[PDB]
Amino acid sequence: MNTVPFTSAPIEVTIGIDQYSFNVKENQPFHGIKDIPIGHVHVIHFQHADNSSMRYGYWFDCRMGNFYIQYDPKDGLYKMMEERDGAKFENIVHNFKERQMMVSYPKIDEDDTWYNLTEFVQMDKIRKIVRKDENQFSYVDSSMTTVQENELSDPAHSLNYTVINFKSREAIRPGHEMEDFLDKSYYLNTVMLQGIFKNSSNYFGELQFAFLNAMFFGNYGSSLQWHAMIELICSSATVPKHMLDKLDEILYYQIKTLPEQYSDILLNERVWNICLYSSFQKNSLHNTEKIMENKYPELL
Amino acid sequence: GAMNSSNYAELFNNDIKLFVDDTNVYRVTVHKTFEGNVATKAINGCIFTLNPKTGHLFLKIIHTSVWAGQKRLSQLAKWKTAEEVSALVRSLPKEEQPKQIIVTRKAMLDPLEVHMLDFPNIAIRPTELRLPFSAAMSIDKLSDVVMKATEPQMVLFNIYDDWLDRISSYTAFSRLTLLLRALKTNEESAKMILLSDPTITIKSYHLWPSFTDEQWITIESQMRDLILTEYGRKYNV
Numbered sequence: 001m002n003t004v005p006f007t008s009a010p011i012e013v014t015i016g017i018d019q020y021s022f023n024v025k026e027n028q029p030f031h032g033i034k035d036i037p038i039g040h041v042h043v044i045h046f047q048h049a050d051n052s053s054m055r056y057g058y059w060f061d062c063r064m065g066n067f068y069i070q071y072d073p074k075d076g077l078y079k080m081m082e083e084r085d086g087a088k089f090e091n092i093v094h095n096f097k098e099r100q101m102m103v104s105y106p107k108i109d110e111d112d113t114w115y116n117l118t119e120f121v122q123m124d125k126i127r128k129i130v131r132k133d134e135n136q137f138s139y140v141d142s143s144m145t146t147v148q149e150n151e152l153s154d155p156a157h158s159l160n161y162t163v164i165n166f167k168s169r170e171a172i173r174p175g176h177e178m179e180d181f182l183d184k185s186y187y188l189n190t191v192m193l194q195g196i197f198k199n200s201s202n203y204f205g206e207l208q209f210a211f212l213n214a215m216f217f218g219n220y221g222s223s224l225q226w227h228a229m230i231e232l233i234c235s236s237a238t239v240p241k242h243m244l245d246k247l248d249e250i251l252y253y254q255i256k257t258l259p260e261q262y263s264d265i266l267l268n269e270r271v272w273n274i275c276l277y278s279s280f281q282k283n284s285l286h287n288t289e290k291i292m293e294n295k296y297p298e299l300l
Numbered sequence: 301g302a303m304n305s306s307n308y309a310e311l312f313n314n315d316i317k318l319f320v321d322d323t324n325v326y327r328v329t330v331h332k333t334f335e336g337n338v339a340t341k342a343i344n345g346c347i348f349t350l351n352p353k354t355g356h357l358f359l360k361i362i363h364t365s366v367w368a369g370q371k372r373l374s375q376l377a378k379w380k381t382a383e384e385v386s387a388l389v390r391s392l393p394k395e396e397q398p399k400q401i402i403v404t405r406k407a408m409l410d411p412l413e414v415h416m417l418d419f420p421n422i423a424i425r426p427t428e429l430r431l432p433f434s435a436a437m438s439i440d441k442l443s444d445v446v447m448k449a450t451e452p453q454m455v456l457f458n459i460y461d462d463w464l465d466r467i468s469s470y471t472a473f474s475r476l477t478l479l480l481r482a483l484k485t486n487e488e489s490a491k492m493i494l495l496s497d498p499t500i501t502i503k504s505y506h507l508w509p510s511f512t513d514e515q516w517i518t519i520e521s522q523m524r525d526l527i528l529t530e531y532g533r534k535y536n537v
């Protein structure tokens with residue numbers, strides 16, 4: 001089990017770690033988060049009490065380094081940093097652990113939620129979507145735009161999701177216009193899976209990451225990407241059976257975890273009604289259809 | 301965006317544009333079968349592609365053989381329309397290609413946009429105008445060429461005859477849409493108005509009769525009277 005220590009908490013802030021959230025008061029003696037499960041990516045995120053503008057946070061994997069958070073009073077945020085001195089980092093963490101100044105990642109033993117939401121998410125793929133090569137962790141915030149949003153504006157601060165556009169030459173083979181527009185299998189299987197992502201695990205990893213950035217930061221471009229990647233599968237007549245079964249599991253856990261009161265802003269009515277009730281795969285997502293109908297029958 | 305009454309003079313500016321109407325592409329008769337079920341029989345159709353400034357009409361005849369063995373024909377007809385308009389554009393010299401294509405029915409937007417991805421600078425637009433181009437098959441010479449076709453064919457016409465020698469394209473389009481609206485509302489009466497006087501004929505190389513300026517005023521008034529008469533009959537006014 002690994003630890004993300006904090007030098008201090010000088011400003012009042014809501015801190016979230018994966019799907020959990022807690023409040024820290026201004027100058028409270030808080031020195032970080034322990035017992036973080038090894039084997040998954042994680043996200044540590046922030047919303048300031050005096051300015052809920054800019055949710056922001058950091059994706060990291062404790063297997064890739066020793067990371068700590070220090071508030072920067074000039075840029076006005078909690079920054080993730082890497083400590084290269086292992087013995088010093090261990091000594092700092094041991095002191096805070098003995099003084100009981102760290103909260104404990106409250107993972108229930110029965111609870112697979114975080115694995116279910118991050119099954120295909122890899123830190124190496126995150127670092128290609130979020131480009132800042134000098135750090136082993138990745139910063140995301142509520143306002144960052146996607147490459148596709150910028151085409152329709154600082155490129156260094158962008159989310160480089162794979163561009164999906166159903167009315168584009170990439171999606172439509174000359175001479176197969178009706179075929180490719182009404183059945184997206186070519187675009188899904190040849191262009192995206194075989195060509196760009198190489199396999200379904202990478203596609204699902206990007207889908208999962210987009211949903212998490214939408215949910216945890218309210219990042220609008222990420223919500224657009226999540227829905228486009230769902231729609232591309234549902235609008236394809238030919239999809240490997242293992243992908244359909246896995247998509248149903250992925251979406252089920254995403255809908256299960258979504259805050260009920262954010263459904264109005266995080267779920268696109270058109271896409272979900274099309275996917276569940278009109279698309280080629282309208283009958284392939286039994287678990288997702290059941291949770292959607294019981295939890296959000298208004299949207300449908 | 302969409303083309304409406306606010307930007308109506310735009311139709312007659314010097315930017316090449318075409319209207320596309322797909323209403324008459326897929327045409328059928330509905331009938332009972334021997335077993336008492338219902339079946340359709342297709343008949344030849346046409347794409348109506350018109351330059352409203354010059355009157356040039358590109359009438360692509362859709363022969364019934366294109367539907368043979370195909371499913372979901374009403375959907376296919378939209379995509380076939382878009383395929384043929386795309387092929388027409390590619391066939392035209394660059395300086396004759398349109399800068400805008402206005403579709404009369406919004407269901408043509410996506411099919412045409414997808415077929416025209418190679419032409420990102422040609423705008424594909426809907427219209428809020430209710431245009432009576434479905435009545436093109438009430439023009440005898442157009443209906444005749446469509447029904448006689450034994451294979452796909454493109455036929456070129458000037459739907460304004462020689463009117464642009466005497467009137468503007470705004471006035472020519474207004475005359476055309478009035479004539480077509482009248483033929484759509486009461487075809488028999490409209491044709492009676494146009495032919496009642498045997499001394500006025502249709503030239504071999506024309507679609508409409510050779511009316512003088514004063515006779516066109518009379519004809520236009522009679523067409524407006526027909527439309528209003530039919531509106532009163534319809535709504536009991």
Ligand SMILES: N#C[C@@H](N)c1cccc(Cl)c1
Binds near residue numbers: 103
């Ligand atoms: N359960 C719960 C939350 N209130 C919570 C409290 C303290 C630490 C963390 Cl991570 C989460």
Ligand SMILES: N#C[C@H](N)c1cccc(Cl)c1
Binds near residue numbers: 005083089092
């Ligand atoms: N000295 C020092 C650094 N500020 C530091 C390194 C590692 C962990 C923490 Cl909380 C602080």
